[PDB]
Amino acid sequence: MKVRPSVKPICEKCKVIKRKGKVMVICENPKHKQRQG
């Protein structure tokens, strides 16, 4: 995953959520995983 201070979608299958206070993007492409909103 990518820990970056600006998480945002990269394609159309990626969608944004919040876990434990962290903003995250989860996708069906494992390249597109991000956290630390």
Partner RNA sequence: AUAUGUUAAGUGGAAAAGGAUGUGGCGUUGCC
Partner RNA sequence: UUGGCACCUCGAUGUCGGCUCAUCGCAUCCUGGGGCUGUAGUCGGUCCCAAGGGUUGGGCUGUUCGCCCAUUAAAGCGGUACGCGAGCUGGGUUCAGAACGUCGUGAGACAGUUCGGUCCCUAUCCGUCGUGGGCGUAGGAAAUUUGAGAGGAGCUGUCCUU
Partner RNA sequence: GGGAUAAGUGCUGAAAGCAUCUAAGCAUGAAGCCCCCCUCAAGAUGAGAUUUCCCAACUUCGGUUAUAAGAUCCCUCAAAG
Q: Which residues are annotated as a binding site for Zn(2+)?
A: 11, 14, 27, 32
Least gap, CB of 13 to RNA (angstroms)? 10
> From CA 20, how far away is CA 13, in angstroms rounded?
23
For residue 34, the minimal CB distance to RNA (Å) is: 9
Q: Are β-strands 34-35 and 22-26 bridged in parallel, bridged antiparallel, or unpaired?
A: antiparallel
Breaks (C-N over 2.5 A) in the chain follow: none
- The tokens for 10 are 């990269």
6 binds RNA (CB under 7 A): yes
Site for RNA, rule CB under 7 A: 1-3, 5-8, 16-21, 23, 26, 30-31, 33, 35, 37
